[PDB]
């Protein structure tokens, strides 16, 4: 018999694909994998297949979000068939977006020891979701990053952030990443951008 598929892992690249990978085990003779997906809260059924980690992908329009969906991987070789343990997924929890893009990194006039970052959202992102963010920043010379986190409401159109607690007349390198609030999968960091605080502390 083939090994029992295990270590099933799925990622939803938002409006691109849903990929599930798994540990196939020792592949001793030609094995076919079939990933059986139940979705739309138990009401719809898709499959994808592959052969001799392993990987398999689903696409719009057979994805809905939000969703609770199940995955089981069947392996079949000459000797016979075997199914993995069932796995249970919340799609929003595994949704990954492209990074944001910062276009402006400069302070507001008169206000010391602070920089303001403005960015656009990734072009593809679920409008019916809150976004969380992590902004990493280091000075020109700095080796280690510092990070701060913040959340933005789905309805909040203001895509700025006031970064306080900084040093005067120092230049900071900055990068930004986002994800839906409920997701474990952060975007890749944005491209780095630079800016400088104003002099003084008044």
């Amino acid at each position, epitope marked *: 018999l083939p090994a029992k598929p295990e270590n099933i892992s799925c990622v939803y690249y938002y*409006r691109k694909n849903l990929t599930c990978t798994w540990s196939p085990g020792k592949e001793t003779s030609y094995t076919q994998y079939t990933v059986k997906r139940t979705y739309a809260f138990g*009401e*719809k059924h898709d499959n994808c297949t592959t052969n001799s980690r392993a990987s398999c992908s689903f*696409f719009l*329009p057979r994805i809905t979000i*939000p969703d609770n969906y199940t995955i089981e991987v069947e392996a079949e070789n000459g000797d016979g068939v075997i199914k993995s343990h069932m796995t249970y997924w919340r799609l929003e929890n595994i949704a990954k977006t492209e990074p944001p893009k910062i276009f402006r990194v400069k302070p507001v006039l008169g206000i010391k020891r602070m920089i303001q970052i403005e960015w656009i959202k990734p*072009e*593809l992102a679920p*409008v*019916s979701s809150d976004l969380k963010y992590t902004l990493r920043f280091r000075t020109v010379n700095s080796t280690s990053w510092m990070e701060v986190n913040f959340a933005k409401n789905r309805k909040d159109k203001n895509q700025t952030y006031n970064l306080t607690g900084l040093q005067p007349f120092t230049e900071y390198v900055i990068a930004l990443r986002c994800a839906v609030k409920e997701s474990k999968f952060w975007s890749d960091w944005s491209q780095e951008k630079m800016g400088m605080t104003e002099e003084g502390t008044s």
Partner: antibody
Amino acid sequence: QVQLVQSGAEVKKPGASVKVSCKASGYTFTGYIMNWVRQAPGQGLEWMGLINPYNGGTDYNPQFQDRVTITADKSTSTAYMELSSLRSEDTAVYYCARDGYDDGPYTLETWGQGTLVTVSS
Amino acid sequence: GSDIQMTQSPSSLSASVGDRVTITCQASEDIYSFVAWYQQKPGKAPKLLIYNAQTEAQGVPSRFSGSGSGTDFTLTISSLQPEDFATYYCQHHYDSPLTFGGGTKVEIK
């Protein structure tokens, strides 16, 4: 704002083929399924097929399997619908439509203005 | 590989401004709540009103409501306005192929 702008009217002989374009703007073209639907004069809606511009995957109504090709070009954000072996009963308005609701796939949320295709000598 | 037929009733009706109107859609098979309703004015593209049997599409007046599940679905217009004299289509959105009902034409008495 999401806009779909289709090519102009067509008149084609029986036996010929037609290719209608549908130019998308105001959104990431590859992020949304594009459907094609038609309506013969005074009649109801019939679904023809869709394409996923992300990877070119198509899905066609079996009533036109041998006849319909749907394509998409990422560089011009344009979807296309070709219908060959035209017969008089293919006379209809042909619509492209975006599937845009995250919680409602296979619904048609934004429509082009339509393209009249008349089939006649 | 779906094989779903949608029938609508009636194919036309006559109503007056202010009337409550109900249009019905029947699926040949259990399709849970995966039904959409479209309005088509003369000479215009269809516009989505309802999906998932009951979710209102963006910018739809509240006088439009959908209900039902399984095989039996209704669109109700609580009080018919001049702009609402039009053809209404249902459509399953279960899985391809997609099929539409034959339509209900709401005409002026």
